[PDB]
Design a protein around this ligand. Structure first.
Ligand code: GQU
Ligand code: GQU
Lengths: 305, 305
């Protein structure tokens, strides 16, 4: 009973967070085995930020210029290299708290948990979706860079995001753990802007299924639609076109509730065209798109890690 | 930049979760030092739930009838006692992962993080407020009882809630760690109903301050009001009466933004009377009341634990 934006338990990730300082700049790093991963802009001063030449900046940096701290204890940096927008700092001690892990480049529309950190210490945990325009809606301040996004599957942590920047619309951009940005963003202080914030249609539908399971049924109508006719209406509202793959992904929720996906599309079409009329669905007055079909199944089935 | 419903890092609480089984019923327990705390209804079968006599039920229970499991390893129960609606199971091993802790009975209007568990294993983390009507808006299924609510202050975990029940409106009820329910709820399968869901006025105001700090300023008007005139309008909307203590608690946010609390009340009064007109504040189309002035300060100042 009840449906909330739920983050994964952060314990396994908390044991990996370290503080990385280079000169005056301090940010977070992720310590897995004998390597610490962190944003490469840790080597920049405020002046450098406008048009940095990271390769040039890095020649003036040796292993000893990187101060790595895990709690109150200093790690010894024995090597360093830049891979795309991240630095990999080889340290002399394997993290004893390293969980079972993998690095994953996540698809737009998928969700993950962010463990927001400052000075290598955890501050909070919240769920995010990698939006179609490759931004996330987070909560990050100066010093948050290096904070990571992850998913847990049983005992294995899949890290998928490292925080690097904010955009003018108050949204956030960052990289996978290989240092490659999601979207067209670059790690420099330039004029960059998020494209159209397209809505994750399959996730709105999954959330409509979670509402039905949790007793909210007012929006169910007596109509149905086709994929092509629904997409004509959803193009107007900047919704992602729904495909047969999306319908198959919603298969289990549709079977659990007895509501065909195209019947849920017709209900969603009525909600887009007519609005909620002051009503709420799972405590919200807007259509929510940051729950995947798996998030709904997980939460409504009590999946543990 | 950005403002999200943020839970505390759950790592310190994850190391305390255990599975408690008694007969066919399995639920969660909290293992701190050599004691495991769990809901007393773990001793009930489905039949017992309608009108249980917990003292009578407990005479047929010995230490060996309580199976306690921390991960894949069984703990040995050397004593048991009932304190209000919780059982305290003395075990032969102190939890090596016991953090610095305290038990706190939280005031209505305050917030905490819930670590939802099933079979003693963590499933997810989310923020809740202890509402004025003494219910919480959580996400809990069968087997979730014994899951706890907490706050972290530096290294000290203050546990304030243990989950026991769901109410007909899809909201949740439970106890402090001394076994005393918040509100008038009882641990039996009877007709119980939440009273009027009063809105936490001081928290809506704190959230309005977070919106201003994060760039959302459309709702700021050219009006002011008095405590007495604001409360006349807010009584109609089932809002908690605002007091001088609440105004003093909002003092630091008012000073940080330069917006007097009574000017923010006038803006809130216009929002209650006229609505949002399809606009949003921090991504929401409703007035949010589950952020305390401290939650806003914490998030906007980057407080770590
Ligand atoms: C790293 O901790 C930090 C996180 C930022 C700070 C505030 N919120 C947030 O998420 N990242 C930065 O400050 C980055 C650094 C690294 C690469 C370039 C430099 C600039 N920047 C950033 O976030 C861009 C700031 C900016 C925002 C905007 F709206 C217009 C701009 F022209 C620049
Ligand atoms: C413990 O795991 C469980 C958690 C519940 C189950 C579903 N969601 C949730 O939060 N608690 C219970 O199931 C309790 C047990 C313990 C004391 C009595 C017994 C009944 N109950 C409960 O939640 C009440 C269920 C109920 C709901 C309702 F709307 C009307 C009713 F008459 C009873």
């Amino acid at each position: 009973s009840g449906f909330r934006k739920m983050a994964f338990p952060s314990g396994k990730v908390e044991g990996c967070m370290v503080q990385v300082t280079c000169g005056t700049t301090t940010l977070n790093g992720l310590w897995l085995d004998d390597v610490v991963y962190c944003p490469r802009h840790v080597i920049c001063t405020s002046e450098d930020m406008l048009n940095p030449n990271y390769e040039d900046l890095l020649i003036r940096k040796s292993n000893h210029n990187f101060l790595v701290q895990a709690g109150n204890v200093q790690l010894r940096v024995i090597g360093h290299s830049m891979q795309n927008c991240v630095l990999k700092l080889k340290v002399d001690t394997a993290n004893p708290k390293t969980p079972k892990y993998k690095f994953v480049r996540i698809q737009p529309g998928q969700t993950f948990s962010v463990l927001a950190c400052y000075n290598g210490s955890p501050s909070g945990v919240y769920q995010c979706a990698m939006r179609p325009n490759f931004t996330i809606k987070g909560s990050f301040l100066n010093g948050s860079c290096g904070s990571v996004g992850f998913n847990i599957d049983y005992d294995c942590v899949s890290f998928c995001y490292m925080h690097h920047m904010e955009l003018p619309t108050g949204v956030h951009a960052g990289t996978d753990l290989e240092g490659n940005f999601y979207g067209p963003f670059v790690d420099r202080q330039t004029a960059q802007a998020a494209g159209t914030d397209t809505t994750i249609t399959v996730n709105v539908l999954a959330w409509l299924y979670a509402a039905v399971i949790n007793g909210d049924r007012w929006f169910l109508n007596r109509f149905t639609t086709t994929l092509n006719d629904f997409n004509l209406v959803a193009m107007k509202y900047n919704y992602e076109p729904l495909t047969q793959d999306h319908v198959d992904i919603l298969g289990p929720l549709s079977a659990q509730t007895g509501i065909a996906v195209l019947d849920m599309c017709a209900s969603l079409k009525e909600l887009l065209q007519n609005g909620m009329n002051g009503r709420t669905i799972l405590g919200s007055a807007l259509l929510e798109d940051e729950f995947t079909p798996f998030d709904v199944v997980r939460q409504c089935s009590g999946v543990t890690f």
